[PDB]
Design a protein around this ligand. Structure first.
Ligand SMILES: Nc1nc2c(ncn2[C@@H]2O[C@H](COP(=O)(O)OP(=O)(O)OP(=O)(O)O)[C@@H](O)[C@H]2O)c(=O)[nH]1
Ligand SMILES: Nc1nc2c(ncn2[C@@H]2O[C@H](COP(=O)(O)OP(=O)(O)O)[C@@H](O)[C@H]2O)c(=O)[nH]1
Ligand SMILES: [Mg+2]
Lengths: 201, 11, 428, 145, 426, 201
């Protein structure tokens, strides 16, 4: 039920968890509907993550790191402003330490493949391909949207483009970095990112 | 109206 | 069984109590539903199977800030008539919140306080969070304090009033509200704690480097102060001081109880990544004059009694070592008739950080509440500001047309000037 | 495993071979970024080539090793210059070369260039050639375990 | 909850509130047919202040449309959002006060004012307790300044303690129509200075001046000007309908702007106002709205504020902003322009932060300033009125249908005492 | 039997249970006709229920949750006023807790399919599609109608659109939240929902 309840991740997760719980119920006093703690979901499938060279990076590769979704658009000038700062921060953090500890997964707000690839051509970090359902499914998960077109349920838009949000293994916001929020500390709030307590378990 | 297009403008 | 009752009057106190109660929920591990999946008893009751309602009442004459709670996330945390709401606000008027519209709901406020305070003996005290610059904060607060003294005579009463700042106001009439409030809460409280909005603004500007914070960022800092205050009534410590012991070791005379606050460390997540939070550091920063939560320089004040509320993995042996350092530091003065003035308290539970907030995860913290002569200047600016406005009868027709007589301004003025006389004779 | 698969090519005439994974023990490693058809590369390649032979095959233990990474635009051109460079190279179709260039900030006039590297894989010495300077780097610097 | 009963006096006030209810329905998600569209709680938890459930689910406004000629009334119904008003809330007039104060107030507004107190008391008593009434009327005419002011009197003997807010337009300084402007202006002032809790002054030459060098509109219509007034007119009553970090109702403004009961006239401004070529070229944060509301080039009254001195002021912010750079920047405009603020009142000005901006905008503000600089507007009506009166000109078009001479002397004497109570603080 | 005897759902219930009772009696001391305490029903068929992700959701998934039917119409200003309050009540109810508590199944009074989809895009809980006769049999079972176009069988009318009906396992009217009824508590009647004891079993 986190972050919201009217998200397709949450509906899909609810369905599969109560299917498996009912499977153990007919197999066997078990509590239902299942608790959000025992409630589990695989968030990224096998063929969902691609790097700059379009090679499959598996879900288990992200073990032991702090992952952040970069809800981003190639045509937004504020996004084009934030992209060099994020690129600098990612390079210097992955290059300061022995292992690499932070990860950026790019979530597209574009409209076509040409603009998508022209925005992909500058990024070293990983991405989610555009005609996957998963990008709009995570879009309605995190309530990030250009301008209100889809009916979101009660809540308005959490944030506008650009945004970076660090991600748990359950899809919860471990921390919302304030680019366009009530703090309005744009193009600097990457410094507020903490990775010692945000771990992709 | 032009006042409608100015005051409540977003684009 | 110890228990404290929270009172939140005014929309400043409602929003302060919103950050105050989500911190209490997280540290005791209750969901907004109200039941976990007996050290919590001082803030939460037992409700059948597993549930817990807060021991608090919410009073405000303006319906919007309380209906926001009834429609928000914590709509089934609070018992439905702990949230008492009026119809019209007091509208920045001490008189109107005192004499006409305050009396049709203060009967319900006492009825609900009767209903929850007789459930157990061993009531420990009352906390009150109000705004002295507003109408319903200082008006309905004054009727509530005088009726609290009449019924609950010997009970301890703590106050956390948002005093108006020297430079920033967000009101024009609040010098009138402050001088009538501080007159009548002098004889109706036991320990008064000064919280100043501009002081917390400078705290989050320098320490966390938050250049643009809202009220909900300031209310987390006040909430952490209350949590480290009543930590001794919730968690086992090496040596604890109850909140009934503050009015023994921090006030030397009944008329002198207005006193400051401080918290250290208050650091961001990347601040902790380059700093070790040694006890000597976090008690030095709590003594630093710019870390005060009242915006008054204590370098020209004169300390009388300081209480330090350590909270975390703090051994008592470097408690005495660290407090001996601030004895020998000549910049901090101490009054001559109080050679020892420190009553420490150590707790084992580390502070709880809210998710997605702005504070870091810390292993030890300090909640310093200190009585000093620096309260002379926090009322000397109300001395000037009330004098300028009342010199030629500014905004007076609103108060006197409400129903109060012309002369409460003068007697509240004279009690404040007598209070300044009482402070300066202490410091000689 | 750093480089990983066969992508590190050892030269061989008749058939094509990958150099084995732990070849690099006790040797000092320099990435040589070059591009064919460049006027400057045309003189940087023979100087570092004569240096390669002279330094490496005086001592009985191999002391230096040079990994060739190229900014070519043509796979046949890459092949005919890999057949001209006598040291280790990388595959054209492999994306490890793109990873190395994008990590090490090689623009597409700084070319050609040397980056001598350490055992974990980070920068240990940067050497441009934009204008006797090649003798600056020493083989006994990056003694690898 | 609180309710604000709207009154539409005069044909100018009819079209002003016609666009006002277009705005309020736009931000509350109200269809012109009365249904709700917008599926959000924040538009509907406080909708009883301006709308009433009508056992069809539709929301009728708590507004009285009141005029002495039916031509402008049928224009409201035939236009958009005119389907929204209740048919019984229109109070038709047949003859019409011909820009004549005496016909509006004494002899021809008398037989209609009993019919409109019937519907004012019907809507007012329908709720348990309301906050006040807002009155939109014109002072350059006869229906507005004559008949609407008698409505201001009658609801004040009957409801004494409710907030009497009025949005009133005044005669314009430079060039004007309706040659008996100072006659209807002074006679409306000396009735309204003791019967109105707060008056918000609007000038049409100021509204024209806004459209030219800050909007770059070559052809502004009256629908353009009505939306200027309505933007700040809902900009005062934000916190009644929407939550905020620092709420403020109309009486919060009343108690915290006037130090004395007889001076309550407020210059009104709105911000941010950007043209088409400059919307995407301007940042939208706190520090540039606060310079905008402190300008002589945005104010919707033609009284230059830097000529006088700001006694007490207020700002109602809306939208998502941080309260700190709001907080010290009301200070920051106070201490750089210290000569423009009064000394014997410390920290002359109030803020109030609301969480809901107008649609399209992310943050806005409405400025309500009690400035001594309105003395130039009063003295301009003064020497225009005494120029006409000393030659007895146009006086038989008042004194011959129910009124006499000496209330003109009392009109200019009350207006002159209103003048003299201002420069003693300047 | 309960709530009303002459409802289509109840009469098909009784016909099916007398089928099974006569069948087992002929196969075999039994009592005929079968008792109301013994009579059994499946309330939603396999492909009936349908979530926001347009995936089919089974009936047995809903036990352990207080589930209620929302009879609503898109052009009704009552439903227009009721929808955000219902959205917020559902959303607070299913965010502030450890498991999912309440559920709503939508029954439509819409004119046509485009109106049905436009109204269904504004609600995230389950719904029953308009051409499915489950909508009309539920309307006749629970006495909900805009206007008299089905003969009410010596009835009156329980409630008009909008309505929320807290349901039990066998089609039992558990409790009625009094929005448009004799109590006339519009949108404050949602707070009377007794999800602790009205449980789908
Ligand atoms: N720290 C803090 N101070 C607040 C908050 N909200 C309001 N204040 C302070 O309260 C003062 C005015 O009092 P208000 O809370 O606005 O109003 P009130 O005390 O309820 O009295 P009324 O205006 O009659 O409702 C302002 O000067 C603010 O400094 C808050 O959320 N946190
Ligand atoms: N701002 C504005 N002013 C108007 C409008 N209609 C008329 N006026 C002004 O009203 C003045 C005439 O007064 P009028 O309303 O005709 O008098 P009434 O018929 O007695 O109400 C003129 O100076 C116009 O400038 C309008 O829609 N907006
Ligand atoms: Mg107040």
């Amino acid at each position: 039920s986190q972050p919201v309840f009217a998200s397709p991740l949450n509906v899909e997760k609810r369905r599969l968890n109560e299917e498996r719980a009912l499977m153990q119920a007919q197999k066997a006093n078990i509590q239902l509907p299942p608790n959000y703690g025992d409630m589990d979901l695989i968030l990224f499938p096998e063929g969902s993550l691609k790097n700059s060279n379009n090679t499959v990076i598996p879900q288990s590769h992200l073990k032991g790191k702090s992952v952040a979704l970069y809800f981003a658009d190639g045509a937004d000038p504020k996004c084009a402003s934030l992209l060099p700062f994020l690129l600098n921060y990612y390079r210097t953090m992955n290059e300061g330490g022995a292992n690499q500890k932070i990860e950026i997964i790019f979530v597209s707000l574009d409209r076509d493949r040409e603009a998508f690839e022209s925005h992909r051509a500058h990024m070293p970090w990983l991405s989610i391909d555009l005609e996957n359902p998963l990008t709009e499914i995570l879009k309605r998960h995190f309530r990030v949207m250009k301008e209100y077109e889809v009916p979101t349920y009660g809540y308005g838009s959490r944030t506008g483009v650009p945004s970076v949000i660090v991600i748990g293994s359950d899809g919860r916001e471990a921390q919302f970095l304030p680019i366009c929020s009530g703090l309005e500390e744009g193009d600097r709030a990457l410094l507020r990112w903490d990775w010692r307590n945000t771990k992709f378990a | 109206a032009v006042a409608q297009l100015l005051r409540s403008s977003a684009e | 069984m110890r228990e404290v009752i929270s009172i939140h009057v005014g929309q400043a106190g409602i929003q302060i109590g919103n950050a105050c109660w989500e911190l209490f929920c997280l540290e005791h591990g209750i969901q907004p539903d109200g039941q976990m999946p007996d050290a919590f008893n001082t803030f939460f009751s037992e409700t059948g199977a597993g549930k817990h309602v807060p021991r608090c009442v919410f009073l405000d004459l303006e319906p919007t800030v309380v209906d926001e709670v009834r429609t928000g996330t914590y709509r089934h945390l609070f018992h439905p008539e702990q949230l008492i709401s009026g119809k019209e606000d007091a509208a920045n008027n001490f008189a109107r919140g005192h004499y006409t519209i305050g009396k049709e709901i203060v009967d319900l406020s006492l009825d609900r306080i009767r209903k929850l305070a007789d459930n157990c003996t061993g009531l420990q005290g009352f906390l009150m969070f109000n705004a002295v610059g507003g109408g319903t904060g200082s008006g309905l607060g004054c009727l509530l304090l005088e009726r609290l003294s009449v019924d609950y005579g010997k009970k301890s009463k703590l106050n956390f009033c948002s005093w108006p700042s020297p430079q920033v106001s967000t009101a024009v009439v609040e010098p009138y509200n402050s001088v009538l409030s501080t007159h009548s809460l002098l004889e109706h409280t036991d320990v008064a704690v000064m919280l100043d909005n501009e002081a917390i603004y400078d705290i989050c500007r320098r320490n966390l480097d938050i250049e643009r914070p809202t009220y909900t960022n300031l209310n987390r800092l006040i909430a952490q102060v209350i949590s480290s205050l009543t930590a001794s009534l919730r968690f086992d410590g090496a040596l604890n001081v109850d909140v009934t012991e503050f009015q023994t070791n921090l006030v030397p005379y009944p008329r002198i109880h207005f006193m400051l606050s401080s918290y250290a460390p208050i650091i961001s997540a990347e601040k902790a990544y380059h700093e070790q939070l040694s006890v000597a550091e976090i008690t030095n920063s709590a003594f630093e004059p710019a870390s005060m939560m009242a915006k008054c320089d204590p370098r020209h004040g004169k300390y009388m009694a300081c209480c330090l509320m350590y909270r975390g993995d703090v051994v008592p042996k470097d408690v005495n070592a660290a407090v001996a350092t601030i004895k020998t530091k000549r910049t901090i003065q101490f009054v001559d008739w109080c050679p020892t003035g420190f009553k420490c308290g150590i707790n084992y539970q580390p502070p709880t950080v809210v998710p997605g907030g702005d504070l870091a995860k810390v292993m030890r913290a300090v909640c310093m509440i200190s009585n000093s002569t620096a309260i002379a200047e926090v009322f000397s600016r109300m001395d000037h500001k009330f004098d300028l406005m009342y010199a030629k009868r500014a905004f007076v027709h609103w108060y006197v047309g409400e129903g109060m007589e012309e002369g409460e301004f003068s007697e509240a003025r004279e009690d404040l000037a007598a209070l300044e006389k009482d402070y300066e004779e202490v410091g000689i | 495993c750093f480089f990983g698969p066969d992508v590190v090519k050892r030269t061989q005439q008749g058939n094509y071979v990958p150099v084995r994974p732990d070849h690099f023990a006790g040797v000092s490693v320099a990435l040589f970024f070059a591009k064919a058809g460049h006027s400057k590369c045309a003189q940087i390649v023979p100087v570092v080539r004569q240096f390669y032979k002279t330094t490496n095959f005086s001592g009985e233990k191999a002391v230096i090793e040079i990994i060739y990474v190229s900014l070519d635009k043509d796979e046949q051109d890459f092949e005919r210059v890999r057949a001209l460079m006598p040291w280790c190279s990388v595959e054209y179709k492999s994306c490890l070369r793109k990873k190395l260039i994008e990590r090490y900030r090689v623009p597409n006039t700084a070319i050609p260039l040397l980056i001598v590297i350490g055992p974990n894989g980070e920068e240990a010495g940067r050497m441009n050639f934009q204008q006797f300077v090649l003798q600056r780097w020493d083989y006994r610097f990056n003694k690898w375990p | 909850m609180r309710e604000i009963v709207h009154v539409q006096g005069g044909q100018c006030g009819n079209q002003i509130g016609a666009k006002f209810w277009e705005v309020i329905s736009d931000e509350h998600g109200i269809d012109p047919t009365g249904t709700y569209c917008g599926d959000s709680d924040l538009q509907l938890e406080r909708i009883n202040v301006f709308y009433n459930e009508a056992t069809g689910g539709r929301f009728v406004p708590r507004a009285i449309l009141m005029d002495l000629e039916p031509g402008t009334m049928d224009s409201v119904r035939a236009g958009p959002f005119g389907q929204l008003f209740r048919p019984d809330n229109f109070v038709f007039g047949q003859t019409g006060a011909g820009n004549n104060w005496a016909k509006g107030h004494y002899t021809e507004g008398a037989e209609l004012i009993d019919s409109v107190l019937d519907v004012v008391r019907k809507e007012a008593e329908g709720c348990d307790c309301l906050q006040g009434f807002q009155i939109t009327h014109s002072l350059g005419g006869g229906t507005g300044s004559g008949m609407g002011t008698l409505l201001i009197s009658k609801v004040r003997e009957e409801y004494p303690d409710r907030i009497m807010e009025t949005f009133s337009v005044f005669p314009s300084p430079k060039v004007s129509d309706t040659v008996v402007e100072p006659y209807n202006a002074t006679l409306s002032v000396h009735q309204l200075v003791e019967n109105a809790d707060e008056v918000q002054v609007i000038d049409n030459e100021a509204l024209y001046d806004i459209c030219f060098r800050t909007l770059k509109l070559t052809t502004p219509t009256y629908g353009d000007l009505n939306h200027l007034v309505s933007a700040a007119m809902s900009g005062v009553t934000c916190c009644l309908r929407f939550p905020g970090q620092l709420n403020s109702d109309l009486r919060k403004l009343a108690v915290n702007l006037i130090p004395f009961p007889r001076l309550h006239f407020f210059l009104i401004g709105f911000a941010p106002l950007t043209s088409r070529g400059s919307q995407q070229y301007r940042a939208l944060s706190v520090p540039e709205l606060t310079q905008q509301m402190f300008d002589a080039k945005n104010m919707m009254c033609a009284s230059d504020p830097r000529h006088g001195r700001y006694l007490t002021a207020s700002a109602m912010f809306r939208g998502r902003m941080s309260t700190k750079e709001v907080d010290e920047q009301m200070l920051n405009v106070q201490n750089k322009n210290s000569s423009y603020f009064v000394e014997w009142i410390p920290n002359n000005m109030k803020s109030s932060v609301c969480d809901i901006p107008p649609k399209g905008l992310k943050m806005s503000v409405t400025f309500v300033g009690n400035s001594t600089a309105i003395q130039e507007m009063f003295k301009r009506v003064s020497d225009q009125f005494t120029a006409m009166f000393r030659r007895k000109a146009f006086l038989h078009w008042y004194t011959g249908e129910g009124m006499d001479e000496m209330e003109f002397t009392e009109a200019e004497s009350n207006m002159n005492d209103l003048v003299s109570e201002y420069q003693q603080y300047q």
